[PDB]
């Protein structure tokens with residue numbers, strides 16, 4: 001029960017988890033370029049688990065990109081955004097469990113992080 | 121009015137159409153001497169999603185006020201059956217003298233957010 | 244694993260669950276008055292479970308009130324809101340699992356409902 | 364300017380202090396012919412949390428634009444170490460002719476929301 005990184009996606013129009021949403025994760029590279037890190041599709045409960053492991057999850061800059069436009073086109077709704085992106089630094093600073101959650105509407109989105117830890 | 125020095129203004133936006141939320145009914149109450157809510161002001165949002173002229177500086181004394189927005193009538197007229205009955209904002213006002221209050225609401229059928237911007241009147 | 248109603252509370256300032264937040268639930272009465280239904284305090288994970296049961300959870304109007312002001316005063320932050328309230332109708336219409344989530348900041352809050360169901 | 368017919372306006376608010384987010388750096392890019400982001404316009408929010416005058420109707424052609432807000436420099440100057448590096452909004456503009464775009468952001472240290480209000484210019 002150790003997932004250093006988890007993504008959750010919700011739909012504000014229908015009051016349900018946003019199922020089958022593509023998610024891509026990149027790590028900032030030395031040349032200051034984005035390199036593919038992990039990717040997947042949200043499950044029936046709007047979640048994506050097992051993107052990585054504590055050993056591979058070192059300090060650095062990460063970018064989480066959510067394909068919100070494909071989600072909305074499948075419902076027959078025209079969206080405003082091309083995609084939703086979250087960029088943050090992961091620091092061993094202290095606590096290492098990260099939950100990124102995204103709430104989606106056709107013209108707006110909100111994102112929040114919940115950073116927590118078992119013990120230390 | 122002036123430019124924007126109203127003691128109380130409400131602004132409602134639509135997260136589904138990316139537009140101002142027009143013709144939304146808004147009701148404001150003040151808590152009375154007896155723990156009961158009394159009618160204070162009423163109105164509807166204009167074509168830019170705003171509601172101006174609800175009160176005056178002199179009438180807007182210190183107190184606990186309730187801003188109730190009728191979101192359910194708004195989604196229903198669009199053919200959508202939403203989650204909430206209404207949106208309500210409860211807050212203590214003019215506590216440490218007069219201030220100008222902007223209450224904003226962003227609406228979606230199963231979600232809403234609300235924010236306040238408080239400014240100190242011509243200092 | 245059957246909780247018709249669950250409440251989740253998060254803190255936007257500190258990126259953590261909002262722990263020990265008082266929550267009260269009322270049911271609209273015939274005289275159109277609010278009657279105490281259930282109450283509790285959020286756990287270490289920001290959640291409140293077991294407010295009720297499927298038999299007691301009949302159709303009607305419910306009001307969930309979150310004591311946000313006490314939460315913020317304990318951190319030494321002066322808040323704008325007296326409390327956060329969610330009013331909704333529970334209809335057997337179809338699906339009966341309700342998750343109310345609230346995200347808190349000193350001057351703003353957002354609430355969303357996730358309505359779902361196992362089978363039917 | 365006029366009253367409010369700017370093709371692109373940005374508005375940043377602070378959810379912790381209930382105020383406009385003043386002196387926030389904003390950078391806008393357009394995707395070029397070669398899948399690369401090119402600099403388009405730059406600026407800072409004023410005392411009301413707004414940014415006016417970034418472009419003109421004639422210069423704002425159809426394309427994919429990126430609005431990047433520097434939220435991290437804003438929280439840091441307040442003594443707070445926030446979660447995000449910045450906030451970014453990516454969207455296709457003027458696709459089916461000219462429109463006026465208002466991008467709003469509401470900020471908190473570990474959260475942000477963004478909304479767009481799109482209007483059809485003097486019809």
Ligand SMILES: Cc1[nH]c(=O)c(C#N)cc1-c1ccncc1
Pocket residue numbers: 133224225226233234235374376467468469476477478
């Ligand atoms: C971006 C934004 N997000 C919210 O969650 C919210 C709420 N409530 C309001 C606004 C906002 C939009 C336009 N002008 C001012 C504030």
Ligand SMILES: Cc1[nH]c(=O)c(C#N)cc1-c1ccncc1
Pocket residue numbers: 008010101102103110111112251253344345346353354355
């Ligand atoms: C991202 C998010 N945004 C909101 O505006 C909100 C409200 N209210 C809740 C959540 C949320 C975060 C984590 N788990 C579930 C929901």
